[PDB]
Design an enzyme around this catalytic site. Structure first.
Site, PDB file in Angstrom:
ATOM      1  N   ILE A 257      42.769  40.892  32.238  1.00  0.00           N
ATOM      2  CA  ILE A 257      42.475  42.281  32.655  1.00  0.00           C
ATOM      3  C   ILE A 257      41.851  43.026  31.488  1.00  0.00           C
ATOM      4  CG2 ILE A 257      43.322  44.405  33.659  1.00  0.00           C
ATOM      5  CD1 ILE A 257      45.558  42.869  34.988  1.00  0.00           C
ATOM      6  N   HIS A 258      40.543  43.190  31.553  1.00  0.00           N
ATOM      7  CA  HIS A 258      39.780  43.784  30.476  1.00  0.00           C
ATOM      8  C   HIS A 258      38.537  44.502  31.041  1.00  0.00           C
ATOM      9  CE1 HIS A 258      36.898  40.766  31.316  1.00  0.00           C
ATOM     10  NE2 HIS A 258      36.470  40.504  30.092  1.00  0.00           N
TER      11      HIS A 258
END
Length: 87
Positions: A13-14
């Site tokens: 998750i970026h």
């Protein structure tokens, strides 16, 4: 409201998907948090969310407190799916 998810994105998750997740959280009156590996941040704070460095295969926990918490949790579930992030 509380729910755990498994991260299914190859990149964790970026970046832009994390941004869209924060924008989904920010729509709701509820206060909302994301927790990974014992560290909890405000899910309306992109800096905090990126700080967690959430990888592929992580388990994460979202919590929401407020009168629209159910809407919030449903919308976050939907974003996590649409962005290929978690289930």
């Amino acid at each position: 409201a509380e729910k755990t998810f498994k991260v299914v994105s190859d990149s964790g998750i970026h970046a832009r998907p994390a941004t869209i997740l924060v924008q989904t959280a920010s729509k709701w009156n509820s206060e909302i948090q994301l927790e990974y590996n014992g560290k909890t941040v405000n899910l309306k704070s992109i800096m905090g969310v990126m700080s967690l460095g959430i990888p592929k295969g992580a388990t994460i926990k979202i919590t929401a407190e407020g009168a629209d918490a159910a809407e919030a949790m449903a919308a976050l579930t939907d974003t996590l799916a649409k962005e290929g992030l978690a289930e």
